[PDB]
Design a protein around this ligand. Sequence first.
Ligand SMILES: NC(=O)C1=CN([C@@H]2O[C@H](COP(=O)(O)OP(=O)(O)OC[C@H]3O[C@@H](n4cnc5c(N)ncnc54)[C@H](O)[C@@H]3O)[C@@H](O)[C@H]2O)C=CC1
Ligand SMILES: NC(=O)C1=CN([C@@H]2O[C@H](COP(=O)(O)OP(=O)(O)OC[C@H]3O[C@@H](n4cnc5c(N)ncnc54)[C@H](O)[C@@H]3O)[C@@H](O)[C@H]2O)C=CC1
Ligand SMILES: O=CNC1CCCCC1
Ligand SMILES: O=CNC1CCCCC1
Ligand SMILES: [Zn+2]
Ligand SMILES: [Zn+2]
Ligand SMILES: [Zn+2]
Ligand SMILES: [Zn+2]
Lengths: 374, 374
Amino acid sequence: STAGKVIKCKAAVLWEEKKPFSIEEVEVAPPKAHEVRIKMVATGICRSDDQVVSGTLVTPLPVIAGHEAAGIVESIGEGVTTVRPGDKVIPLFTPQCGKCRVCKHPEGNFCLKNDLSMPRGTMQDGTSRFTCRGKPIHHFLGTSTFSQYTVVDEISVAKIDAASPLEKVCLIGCGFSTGYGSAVKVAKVTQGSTCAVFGLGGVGLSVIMGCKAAGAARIIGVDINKDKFAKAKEVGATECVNPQDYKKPIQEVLTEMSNGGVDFSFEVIGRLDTMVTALSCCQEAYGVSVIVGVPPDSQNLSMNPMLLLSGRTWKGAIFGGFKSKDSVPKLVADFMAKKFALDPLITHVLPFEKINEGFDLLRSGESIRTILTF
Amino acid sequence: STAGKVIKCKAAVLWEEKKPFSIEEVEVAPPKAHEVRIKMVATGICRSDDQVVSGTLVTPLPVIAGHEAAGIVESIGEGVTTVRPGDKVIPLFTPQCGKCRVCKHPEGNFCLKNDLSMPRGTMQDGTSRFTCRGKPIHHFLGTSTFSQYTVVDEISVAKIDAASPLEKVCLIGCGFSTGYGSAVKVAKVTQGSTCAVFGLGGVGLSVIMGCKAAGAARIIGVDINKDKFAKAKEVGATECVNPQDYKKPIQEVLTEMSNGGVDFSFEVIGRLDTMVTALSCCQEAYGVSVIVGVPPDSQNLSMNPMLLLSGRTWKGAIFGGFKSKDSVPKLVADFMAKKFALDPLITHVLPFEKINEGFDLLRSGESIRTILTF
Ligand SMILES: NC(=O)C1=CN([C@@H]2O[C@H](COP(=O)(O)OP(=O)(O)OC[C@H]3O[C@@H](n4cnc5c(N)ncnc54)[C@H](O)[C@@H]3O)[C@@H](O)[C@H]2O)C=CC1
Ligand SMILES: NC(=O)C1=CN([C@@H]2O[C@H](COP(=O)(O)OP(=O)(O)OC[C@H]3O[C@@H](n4cnc5c(N)ncnc54)[C@H](O)[C@@H]3O)[C@@H](O)[C@H]2O)C=CC1
Ligand SMILES: O=CNC1CCCCC1
Ligand SMILES: O=CNC1CCCCC1
Ligand SMILES: [Zn+2]
Ligand SMILES: [Zn+2]
Ligand SMILES: [Zn+2]
Ligand SMILES: [Zn+2]
């Protein structure tokens, strides 16, 4: 019926920085070879989507943002083999081509087909499937989930269990997997360790979940918003600290609290100052610090390399280090088998048409994840 | 009989920065409880000792420098159990107390009794065993090997094989173990990998030996002094590049040479700029960069944390990550078993009285290791 035809549908178009999204009709072209058109069912509001509006995460405008989502395949282009119409799918903002040197590496996940390092805001073929007011509109990270329909490359979609609750498992497309994999796969948090988690939003709470799963003895949440502390303790924080409470820099506080520095620290905010603070607070000889937060475009940090020479390890990761297309269906299977909880991350639910209210909730500090339903 | 008595002997005293060493008579106190007085046999000239002269490595002056050495125990203080008079020994500039949280950690070696982080230039008890022209003279890293006799704490000395050649194994006290362990223990270089080594002095050549032992397929040496390239190839470099030969920054050259970035990079120089270049030239998703060189005191580097967010790992280490008192005897045993070579690091052998000439050979580019013999 709609196969092979342009679909006219509602999307949230961002015409310029620092403005509300515009909910209006777009034209969604049918999928080309090795492309998949998806009817969206639910999408989450991640701070990365806000960063696009703030201009601190740079991608070409105008754009259809959104990258944390789940839906149902509407149609497949020629040569698609890994999904079919009617399949439940999660779009992958980090693709998995399976062919590049990264995809073939045992540890690597940052596939060389990504649109994150040098964003074009297109499909793999360097064109757009979106028109609004007769003007072409950019894609975002090969996903663009703030639309009733989107088109993605095959390497940017995973088929998931037919019985999964899409209004929950959408968080596996970004914030849960990112935080959980940061702890269990990138840091490799050990049993009995002391962790510090900087930032207690959806992604930091998922890092806590991962530290708890790994058997950490102490999980210290760090946030300047003390309203975040109760939920951080519910999902495994053993104690919470607000830097604003202290006369001393928090790295010194966390060093004293952990009797010489923590085993593992995580920056889950996106500030240069807290990336350096998080490295400093891990133990100088054997500590590991993981950058998860996305820092402001084109800005450098300053740091003393003696922090590394003593023995620290500093690393970062996209999407929790997970190879996206292998990992997402397994993560959904694990959720279905009650291996981790998503409900603690979901604080608010809104129809897609109230997207701007959803972004107001995040910016106020009130929400963790708002899930938008189409 | 010198046991229990002050020894008057020859030492190389550094009275102030940027001056030659003064070869003169010093007084060496007998060892107190848990102290060891050593007759030195051979000591190497390490760039770290030159950095004390330059003022880029800060330690209290005046000082008896020297940390890369081997000698024979002359006498032991009360309570000493791990060495005896007549034993061959290597002083440990990183101690191994065996009791602190680091010494008990499987991957830590930066023992909390170290005199590196906040240098006092004393014995563990906060006093000095050296006087010269009626003035107290500081110790350096708890070793001070530019002296016919030194006194060290027991946790800063290892017993080695009675048959070892001290004019070669002195290098296990610093440069060989530092570079070799940076490759095999800290980086954990893999078989078939591509490595880049910035700086082809004694420590960088030892990194190359460790990358070769680990089965690297490609080992790219990087030095501005092309006279360093022949020896780097002898010990395992597959190609050498001089940044000065290129119009482009060398991180771009090494990324192209390695078809998208190296597996492992090592900074073995001590410059902030080359620390950032070495991080940048490792593959952005799964690369590992190790800081070995000592940067200039109190200077910060500037870097874009997106280099880490993509998946890089950045770490540093002291003494190749080896727990010093456990590892040094085993390394000497391995040298005796022909598991690695030290002769390729030794370009010059001078009597101790020619220490200044040795330092001039290093500064001029002409030497790798000069060994001074007492
Ligand atoms: N590496 C990756 O693959 C991913 C990265 N990100 C990034 O992770 C970060 C966190 O994302 P969300 O959890 O959605 O954001 P969020 O805004 O809900 O959470 C961040 C938290 O940081 C706290 N915070 C702000 N300034 C702080 C300070 N100076 N000190 C201590 N706490 C402070 C806030 O109060 C807030 O609770 C953002 O930068 C986001 O762009 C998100 C997902 C994927
Ligand atoms: N982490 C640790 O435990 C240890 C650190 N050190 C440090 O390791 C470094 C190397 O020590 P050595 O091998 O004894 O020094 P070295 O001076 O013999 O070798 C340094 C090499 O770097 C090259 N170089 C200088 N500027 C360069 C540039 N801009 N680009 C490329 N090459 C450049 C020189 O030409 C030279 O061959 C020093 O900073 C020293 O203090 C040494 C031993 C222990
Ligand atoms: O939140 C999802 N993706 C982020 C990942 C980090 C780089 C910017 C985009
Ligand atoms: O070369 C020997 N030791 C160095 C180790 C790093 C700090 C300066 C001292
Ligand atoms: Zn996200
Ligand atoms: Zn790929
Ligand atoms: Zn110790
Ligand atoms: Zn040295």
